[PDB]
PDB file of C-alpha atoms in Angstrom:
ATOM      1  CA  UNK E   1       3.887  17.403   7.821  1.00 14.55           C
ATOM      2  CA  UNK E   2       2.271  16.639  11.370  1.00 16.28           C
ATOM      3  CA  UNK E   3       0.882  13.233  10.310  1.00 18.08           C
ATOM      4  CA  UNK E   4       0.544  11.926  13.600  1.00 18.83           C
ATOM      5  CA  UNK E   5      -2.868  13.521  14.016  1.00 19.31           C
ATOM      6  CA  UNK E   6      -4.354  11.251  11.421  1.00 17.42           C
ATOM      7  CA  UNK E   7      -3.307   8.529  13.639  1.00 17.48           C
ATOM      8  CA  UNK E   8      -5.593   9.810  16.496  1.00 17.89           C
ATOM      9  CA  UNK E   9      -8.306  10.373  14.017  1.00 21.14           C
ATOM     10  CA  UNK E  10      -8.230   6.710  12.791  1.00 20.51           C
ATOM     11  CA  UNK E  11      -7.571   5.494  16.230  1.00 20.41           C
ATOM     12  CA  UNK E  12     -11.121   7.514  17.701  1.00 24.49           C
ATOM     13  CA  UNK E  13     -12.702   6.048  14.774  1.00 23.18           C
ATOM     14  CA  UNK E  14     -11.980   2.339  15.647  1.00 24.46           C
ATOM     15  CA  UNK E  15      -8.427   1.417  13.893  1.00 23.79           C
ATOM     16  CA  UNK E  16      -7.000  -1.382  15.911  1.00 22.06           C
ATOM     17  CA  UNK E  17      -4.144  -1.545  13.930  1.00 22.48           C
ATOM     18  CA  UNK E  18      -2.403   1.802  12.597  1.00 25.15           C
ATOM     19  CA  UNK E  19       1.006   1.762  11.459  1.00 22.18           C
ATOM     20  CA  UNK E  20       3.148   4.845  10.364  1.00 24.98           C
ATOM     21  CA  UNK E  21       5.933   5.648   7.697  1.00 24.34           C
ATOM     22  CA  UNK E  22       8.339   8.363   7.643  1.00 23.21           C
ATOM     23  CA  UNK E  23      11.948   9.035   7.354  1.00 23.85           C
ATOM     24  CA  UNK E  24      12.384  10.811  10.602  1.00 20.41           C
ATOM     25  CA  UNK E  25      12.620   8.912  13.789  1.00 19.46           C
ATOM     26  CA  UNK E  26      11.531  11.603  16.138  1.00 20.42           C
ATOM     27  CA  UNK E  27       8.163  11.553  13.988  1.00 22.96           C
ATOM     28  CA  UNK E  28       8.245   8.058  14.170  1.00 17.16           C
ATOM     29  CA  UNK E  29       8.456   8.043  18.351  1.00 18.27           C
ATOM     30  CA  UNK E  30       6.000  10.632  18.425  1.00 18.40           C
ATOM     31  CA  UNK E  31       3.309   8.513  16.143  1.00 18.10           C
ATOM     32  CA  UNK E  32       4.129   5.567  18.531  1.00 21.11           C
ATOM     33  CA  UNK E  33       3.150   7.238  21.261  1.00 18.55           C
ATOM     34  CA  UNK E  34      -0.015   8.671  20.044  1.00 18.00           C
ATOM     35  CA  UNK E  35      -1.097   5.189  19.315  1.00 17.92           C
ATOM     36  CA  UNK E  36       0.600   4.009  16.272  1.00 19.12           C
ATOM     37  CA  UNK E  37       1.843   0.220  16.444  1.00 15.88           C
ATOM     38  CA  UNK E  38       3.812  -0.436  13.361  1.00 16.91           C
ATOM     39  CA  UNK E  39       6.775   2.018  12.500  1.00 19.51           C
ATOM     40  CA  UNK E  40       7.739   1.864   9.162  1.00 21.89           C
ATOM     41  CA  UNK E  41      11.295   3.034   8.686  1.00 18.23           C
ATOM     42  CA  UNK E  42      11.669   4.065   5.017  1.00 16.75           C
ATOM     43  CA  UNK E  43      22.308   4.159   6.372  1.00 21.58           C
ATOM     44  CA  UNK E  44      18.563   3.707   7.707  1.00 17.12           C
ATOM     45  CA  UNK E  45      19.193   1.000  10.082  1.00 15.07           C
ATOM     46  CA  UNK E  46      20.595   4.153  12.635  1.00 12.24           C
ATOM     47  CA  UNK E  47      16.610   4.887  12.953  1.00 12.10           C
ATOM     48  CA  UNK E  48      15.203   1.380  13.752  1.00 13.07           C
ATOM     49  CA  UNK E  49      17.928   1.383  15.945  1.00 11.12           C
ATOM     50  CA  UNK E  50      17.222   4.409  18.426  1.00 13.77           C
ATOM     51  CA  UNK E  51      13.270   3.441  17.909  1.00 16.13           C
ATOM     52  CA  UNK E  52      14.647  -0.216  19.256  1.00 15.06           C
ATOM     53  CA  UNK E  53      16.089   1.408  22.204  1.00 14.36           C
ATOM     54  CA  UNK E  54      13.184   3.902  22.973  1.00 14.93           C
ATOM     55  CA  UNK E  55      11.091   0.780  23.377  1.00 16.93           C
ATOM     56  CA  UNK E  56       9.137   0.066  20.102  1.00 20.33           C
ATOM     57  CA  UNK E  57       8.295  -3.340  19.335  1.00 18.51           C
ATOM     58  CA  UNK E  58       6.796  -3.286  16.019  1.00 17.88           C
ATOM     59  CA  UNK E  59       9.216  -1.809  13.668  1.00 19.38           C
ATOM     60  CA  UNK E  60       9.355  -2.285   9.686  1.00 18.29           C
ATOM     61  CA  UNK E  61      11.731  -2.100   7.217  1.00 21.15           C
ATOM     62  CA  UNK E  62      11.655  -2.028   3.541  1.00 20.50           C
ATOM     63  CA  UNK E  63      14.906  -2.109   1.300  1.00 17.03           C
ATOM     64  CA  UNK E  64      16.538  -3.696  -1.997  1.00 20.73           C
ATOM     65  CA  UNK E  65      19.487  -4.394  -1.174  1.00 17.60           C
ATOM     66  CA  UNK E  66      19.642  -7.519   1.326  1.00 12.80           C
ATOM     67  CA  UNK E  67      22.491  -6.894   3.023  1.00  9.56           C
ATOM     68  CA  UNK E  68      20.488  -3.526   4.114  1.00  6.61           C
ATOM     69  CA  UNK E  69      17.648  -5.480   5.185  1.00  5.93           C
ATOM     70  CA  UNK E  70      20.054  -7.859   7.201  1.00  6.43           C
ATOM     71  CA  UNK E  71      21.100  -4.892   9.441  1.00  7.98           C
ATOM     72  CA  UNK E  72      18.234  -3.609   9.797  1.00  4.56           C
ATOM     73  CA  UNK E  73      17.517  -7.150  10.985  1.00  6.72           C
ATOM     74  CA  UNK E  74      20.307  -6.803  13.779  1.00  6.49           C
ATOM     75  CA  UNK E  75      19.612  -3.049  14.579  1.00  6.60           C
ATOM     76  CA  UNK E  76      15.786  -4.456  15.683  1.00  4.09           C
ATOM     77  CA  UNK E  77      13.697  -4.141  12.836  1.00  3.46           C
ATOM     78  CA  UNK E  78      11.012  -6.686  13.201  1.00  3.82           C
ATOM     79  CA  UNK E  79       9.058  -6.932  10.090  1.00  2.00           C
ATOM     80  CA  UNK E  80      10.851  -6.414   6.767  1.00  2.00           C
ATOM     81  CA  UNK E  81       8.795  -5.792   3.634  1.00  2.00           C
ATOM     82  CA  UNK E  82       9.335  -7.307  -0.278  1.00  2.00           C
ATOM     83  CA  UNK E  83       8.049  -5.194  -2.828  1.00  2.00           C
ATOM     84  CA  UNK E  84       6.976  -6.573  -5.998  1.00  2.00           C
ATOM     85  CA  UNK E  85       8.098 -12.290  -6.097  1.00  2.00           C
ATOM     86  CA  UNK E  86       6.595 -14.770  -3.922  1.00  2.00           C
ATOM     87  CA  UNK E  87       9.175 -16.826  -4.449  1.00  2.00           C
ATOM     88  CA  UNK E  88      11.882 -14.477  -1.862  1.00  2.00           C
ATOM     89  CA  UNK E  89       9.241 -15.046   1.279  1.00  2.00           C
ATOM     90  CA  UNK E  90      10.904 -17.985   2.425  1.00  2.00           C
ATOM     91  CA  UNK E  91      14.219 -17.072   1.441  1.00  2.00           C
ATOM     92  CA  UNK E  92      13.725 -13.996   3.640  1.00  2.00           C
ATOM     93  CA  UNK E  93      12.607 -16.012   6.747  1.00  2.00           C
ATOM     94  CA  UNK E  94      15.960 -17.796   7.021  1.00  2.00           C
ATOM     95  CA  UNK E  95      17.785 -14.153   7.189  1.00  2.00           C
ATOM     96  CA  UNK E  96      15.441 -14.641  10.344  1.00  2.00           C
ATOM     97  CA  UNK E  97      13.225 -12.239   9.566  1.00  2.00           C
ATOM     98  CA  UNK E  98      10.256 -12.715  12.283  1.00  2.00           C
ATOM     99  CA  UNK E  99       7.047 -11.007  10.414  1.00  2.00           C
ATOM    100  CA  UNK E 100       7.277 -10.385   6.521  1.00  2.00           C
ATOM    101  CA  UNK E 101       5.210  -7.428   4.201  1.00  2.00           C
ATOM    102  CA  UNK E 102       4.459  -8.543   0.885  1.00  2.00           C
ATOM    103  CA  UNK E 103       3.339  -5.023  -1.322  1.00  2.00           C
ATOM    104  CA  UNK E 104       1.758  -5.694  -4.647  1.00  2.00           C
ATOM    105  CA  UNK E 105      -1.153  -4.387  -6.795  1.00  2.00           C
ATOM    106  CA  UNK E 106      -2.250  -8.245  -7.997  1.00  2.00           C
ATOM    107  CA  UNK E 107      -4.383  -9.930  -5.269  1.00  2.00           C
ATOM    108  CA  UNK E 108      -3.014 -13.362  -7.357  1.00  2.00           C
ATOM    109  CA  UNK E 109       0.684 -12.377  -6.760  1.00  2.00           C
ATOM    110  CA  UNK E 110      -0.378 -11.165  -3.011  1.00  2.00           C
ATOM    111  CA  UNK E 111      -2.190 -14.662  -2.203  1.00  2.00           C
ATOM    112  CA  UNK E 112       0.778 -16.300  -3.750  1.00  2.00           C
ATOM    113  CA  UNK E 113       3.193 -14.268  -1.469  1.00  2.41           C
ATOM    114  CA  UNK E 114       0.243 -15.119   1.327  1.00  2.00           C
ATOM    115  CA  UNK E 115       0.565 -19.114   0.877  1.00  2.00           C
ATOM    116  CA  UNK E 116       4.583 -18.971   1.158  1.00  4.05           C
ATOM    117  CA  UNK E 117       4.684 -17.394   4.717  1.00  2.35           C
ATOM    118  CA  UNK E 118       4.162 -13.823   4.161  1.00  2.00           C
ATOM    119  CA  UNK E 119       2.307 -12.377   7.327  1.00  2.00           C
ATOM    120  CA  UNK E 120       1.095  -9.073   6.195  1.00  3.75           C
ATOM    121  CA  UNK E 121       0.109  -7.670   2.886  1.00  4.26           C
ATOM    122  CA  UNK E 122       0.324  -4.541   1.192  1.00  6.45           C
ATOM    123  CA  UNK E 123      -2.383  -3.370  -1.610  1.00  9.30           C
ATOM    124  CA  UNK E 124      -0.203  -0.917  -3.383  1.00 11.25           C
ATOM    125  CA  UNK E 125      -2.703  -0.230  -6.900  1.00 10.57           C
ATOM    126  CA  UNK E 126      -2.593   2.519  -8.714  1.00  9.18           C
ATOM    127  CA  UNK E 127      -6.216   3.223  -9.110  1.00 11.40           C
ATOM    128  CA  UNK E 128      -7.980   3.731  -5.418  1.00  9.71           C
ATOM    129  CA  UNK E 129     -11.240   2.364  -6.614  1.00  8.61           C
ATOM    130  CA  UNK E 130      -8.992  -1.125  -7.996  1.00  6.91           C
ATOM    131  CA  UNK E 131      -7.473  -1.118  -4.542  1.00  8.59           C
ATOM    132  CA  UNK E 132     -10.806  -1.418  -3.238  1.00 12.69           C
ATOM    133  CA  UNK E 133     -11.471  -4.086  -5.116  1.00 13.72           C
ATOM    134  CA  UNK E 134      -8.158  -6.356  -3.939  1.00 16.13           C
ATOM    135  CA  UNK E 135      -8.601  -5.812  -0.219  1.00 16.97           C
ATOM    136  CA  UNK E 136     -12.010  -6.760  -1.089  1.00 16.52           C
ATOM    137  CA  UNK E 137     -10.895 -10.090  -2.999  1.00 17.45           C
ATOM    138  CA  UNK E 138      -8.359 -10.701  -0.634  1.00 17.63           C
ATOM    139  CA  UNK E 139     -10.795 -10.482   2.104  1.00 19.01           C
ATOM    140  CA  UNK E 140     -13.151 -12.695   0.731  1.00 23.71           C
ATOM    141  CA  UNK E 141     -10.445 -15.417   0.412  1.00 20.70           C
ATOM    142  CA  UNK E 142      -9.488 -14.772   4.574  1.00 24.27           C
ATOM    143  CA  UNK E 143      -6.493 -13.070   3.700  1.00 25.23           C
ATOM    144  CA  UNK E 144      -4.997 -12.053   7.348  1.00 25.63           C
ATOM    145  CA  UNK E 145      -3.255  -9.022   7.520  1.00 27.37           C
ATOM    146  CA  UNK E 146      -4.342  -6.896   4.960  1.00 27.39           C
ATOM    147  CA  UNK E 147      -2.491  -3.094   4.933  1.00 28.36           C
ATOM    148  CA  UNK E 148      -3.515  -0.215   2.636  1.00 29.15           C
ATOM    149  CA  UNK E 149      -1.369   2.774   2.913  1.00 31.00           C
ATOM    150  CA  UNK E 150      -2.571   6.151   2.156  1.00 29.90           C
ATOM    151  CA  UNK E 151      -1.690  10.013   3.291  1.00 33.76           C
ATOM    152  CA  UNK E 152      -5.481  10.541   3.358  1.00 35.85           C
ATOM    153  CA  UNK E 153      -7.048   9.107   6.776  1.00 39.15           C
ATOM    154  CA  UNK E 154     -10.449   9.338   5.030  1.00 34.14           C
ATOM    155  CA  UNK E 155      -9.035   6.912   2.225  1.00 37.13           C
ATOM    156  CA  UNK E 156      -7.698   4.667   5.315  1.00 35.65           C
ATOM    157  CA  UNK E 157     -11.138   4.845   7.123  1.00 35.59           C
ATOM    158  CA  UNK E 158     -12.612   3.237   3.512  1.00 32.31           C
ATOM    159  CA  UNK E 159      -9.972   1.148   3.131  1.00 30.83           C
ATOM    160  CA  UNK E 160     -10.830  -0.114   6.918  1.00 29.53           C
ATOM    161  CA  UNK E 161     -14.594  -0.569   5.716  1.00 24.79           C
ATOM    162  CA  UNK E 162     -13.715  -2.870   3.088  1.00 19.93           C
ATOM    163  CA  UNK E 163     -11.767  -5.060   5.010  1.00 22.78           C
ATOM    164  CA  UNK E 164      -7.891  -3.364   5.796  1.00 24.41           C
ATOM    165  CA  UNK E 165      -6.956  -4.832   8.739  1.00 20.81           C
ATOM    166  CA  UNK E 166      -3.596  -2.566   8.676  1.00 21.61           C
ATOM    167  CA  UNK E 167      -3.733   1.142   7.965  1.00 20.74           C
ATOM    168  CA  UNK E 168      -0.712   2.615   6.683  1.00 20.54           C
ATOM    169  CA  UNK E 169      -0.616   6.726   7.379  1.00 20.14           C
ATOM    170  CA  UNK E 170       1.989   7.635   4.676  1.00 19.42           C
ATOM    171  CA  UNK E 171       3.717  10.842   6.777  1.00 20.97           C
ATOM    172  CA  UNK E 172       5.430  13.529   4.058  1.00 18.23           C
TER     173      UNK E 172
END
């Protein structure tokens, strides 16, 4: 409901980088302002849009359909996120995407997506104890960038001790 209260939570407890997801672009301005720096917009290129013009400059977008993730391209949206190939990273740059989220539950397929370009990426496993394990991995190998999304903050703050650099708070 009122996710933006995990953000300060995560924030006082030393998140440098919190980023926030949600289908509503007041609660998307009001997480921005209580500290989030990545809005994650979920006919949805009219939000990254107004956040554009209310002065965010961090916004993600995540879509099928390409021709949706060109607009959203246009309207602002600065990071655009592939759910999963690997093989799309580069593909996606020259619709001139600027930063690119790669989500995956393989570490293999998330280094692979890590060597072509992609700048962020996204532990999505089912398990939360074989999440652990992949930011882990992928912190071991110097992954950059590593975001683990959850709608519990104390999941995040774990996620943030095993090496998260990016924590998602999943708003709902």
């Amino acid at each position: 409901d009122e996710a933006w209260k995990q953000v300060e939570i995560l924030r006082r407890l030393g998140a440098k980088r919190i980023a926030y997801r949600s289908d509503d672009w007041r609660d998307l301005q009001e997480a921005l302002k209580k500290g989030a720096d990545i809005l994650i917009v979920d006919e949805a290129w009219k939000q990254v849009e107004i956040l554009r013009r209310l002065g965010a400059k961090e916004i993600a977008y995540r879509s099928d359909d390409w021709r949706d993730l060109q607009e959203a391209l246009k309207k602002g949206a600065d990071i655009l996120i592939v759910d999963a190939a690997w093989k799309q990273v580069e593909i996606l740059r020259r619709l001139g995407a600027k930063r690119i989220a790669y989500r995956s539950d393989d570490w293999r397929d998330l280094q692979e997506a890590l060597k072509k370009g992609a700048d962020i990426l996204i532990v999505d496993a089912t398990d939360k104890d074989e999440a652990w394990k992949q930011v882990e991995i992928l912190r071991r190998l110097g992954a950059k960038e590593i975001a683990y999304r959850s709608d519990d903050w104390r999941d995040l703050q774990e996620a943030l001790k095993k090496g998260a650099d990016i924590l998602i708070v999943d708003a709902t």
